[PDB]
């Protein structure tokens, strides 16, 4: 009544902003993307950029397990 509250699902904690949530796991989430000849690994914290594979013919799609 007169306001709203924001809730983060299990595995997430809520920032002082109230509107935003952060993830509880210690392992850094990272991005994987592929060009024609490369598969690259980039970290969302921006600290790291690395190579997964090179010389492939045409890497058009990726998925993980």
Partner 1 sequence: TEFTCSNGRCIPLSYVCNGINNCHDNDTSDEKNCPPITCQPDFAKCQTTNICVPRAFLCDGDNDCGDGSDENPIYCASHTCRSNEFQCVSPHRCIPSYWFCDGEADCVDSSDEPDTCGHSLNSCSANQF
Ligand X SMILES: *[C@@H]1O[C@H](CO)[C@H](O)[C@H](O)[C@H]1NC(C)=O
Residues that bind partner 1 (CB under 8 A): 1, 5, 7, 13, 15-16, 22, 24, 26, 47
Chain centroid to CA 37 = 22
Q: Which does 15 bind (CB under 5 to 8 A by kind): ligand X, partner 1, none?
A: partner 1
- For residue 50, the minimal CB distance to ligand X (Å) is 12
For Cα atoms 46, 48, 44, give the angle at the middle one, nearest 5 degrees. 35
Interface with ligand X includes 4 (CB under 6 A)?
yes
Interacting residues of 39 by C-beta distance below 8 A, sequence separation 6+: 32, 33, 51, 52, 53, 54, 56, 59, 62
Q: Which does 4 bind (CB under 5 to 8 A by kind): partner 1, ligand X, none?
A: ligand X
């Amino acid at each position: 009544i007169g306001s709203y509250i924001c809730k983060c699902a299990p595995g997430y904690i809520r920032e002082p902003d109230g509107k935003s949530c952060r993830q509880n796991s210690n392992i850094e989430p990272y991005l994987v993307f592929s060009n024609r000849y490369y598969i690259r690994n980039l970290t969302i914290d921006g600290t790291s950029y690395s190579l997964i594979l090179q010389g492939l013919g045409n890497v058009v799609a990726l998925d993980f397990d």
